[PDB]
Amino acid sequence: FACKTANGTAIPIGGGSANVYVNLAPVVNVGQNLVVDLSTQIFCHNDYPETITDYVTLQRGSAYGGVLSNFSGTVKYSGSSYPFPTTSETPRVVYNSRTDKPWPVALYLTPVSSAGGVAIKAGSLIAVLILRQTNNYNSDDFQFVWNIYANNDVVVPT
Numbered sequence: 001f002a003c004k005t006a007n008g009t010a011i012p013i014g015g016g017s018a019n020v021y022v023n024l025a026p027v028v029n030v031g032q033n034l035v036v037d038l039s040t041q042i043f044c045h046n047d048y049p050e051t052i053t054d055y056v057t058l059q060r061g062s063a064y065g066g067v068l069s070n071f072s073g074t075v076k077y078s079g080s081s082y083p084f085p086t087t088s089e090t091p092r093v094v095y096n097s098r099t100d101k102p103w104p105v106a107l108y109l110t111p112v113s114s115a116g117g118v119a120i121k122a123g124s125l126i127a128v129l130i131l132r133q134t135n136n137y138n139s140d141d142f143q144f145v146w147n148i149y150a151n152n153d154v155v156v157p158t
C-alpha cells in the first residue's frame with residue numbers, strides 16, 4: 001500500500017508525510033462553502049490485491065492557519081460527513097487494486113467572521129489529514145500524513 005499526490009510526491013509502504021498544495025477559490029462569500037477536495041490530489045493503491053485487502057480510514061483531521069481562525073465546517077469521507085476538526089476515526093474504506101484510486105476526502109468550509117481581509121494566506125499550513133492503513137493479512141498499522149498548504153490567497157469580501 002502506497003500513495004502519491006497530483007504533483008508526484010510519493011509516500012511509500014509503511015507511511016510517512018507529504019506536503020499537498022491545494023488550489024482554493026480565491027473569493028468565498030459570506031454564506032458560501034469553500035471546497036477543499038483532496039480526492040483529486042491524493043491517490044493510493046494496494047500492492048498485492050490478489051491476496052491482501054487493505055483498509056483505509058481518515059484517522060484524524062486538524063485545522064490550522066486561516067482555516068482554523070476564520071472558517072468552520074465539516075469533512076466528507078467516502079460519502080459521509082463528520083465534524084472538522086475531527087473528533088473520531090472514520091469507518092474504513094477497502095483498497096483492492098494496484099490501480100491508483102482517490103482518497104475520498106473533502107473539506108467544506110464556511111466563513112465565520114470577515115471584514116474583507118485575507119482569510120487564507122498562500123503558502124500557509126491549513127490542515128493536517130492523517131490516513132491510517134491496515135489490512136487483512138498481518139499486523140501492519142501505518143500512518144500517511146498529509147500536510148495541506150494553501151496554494152493561493154482566499155478573500156472573504158464584505
Ligand SMILES: CN1CCN(c2c(Nc3ccc(O[C@H]4O[C@H](CO)[C@@H](O)[C@H](O)[C@@H]4O)c(Cl)c3)c(=O)c2=O)CC1
Nearest residue numbers: 001002013014045046047048052053054134135137140
Ligand atoms: C505474484 N507475486 C506477488 C508478490 N509476492 C508476494 C508478496 N507481496 C507483498 C507486497 C506488499 C506487501 O505489503 C505491503 O502491501 C500490502 C498490500 O497493499 C499492504 O497491506 C502492506 O501493509 C504493505 O504496504 C506484502 Cl505484505 C506482500 C508476498 O507476501 C508474496 O508472496 C509473490 C507473488
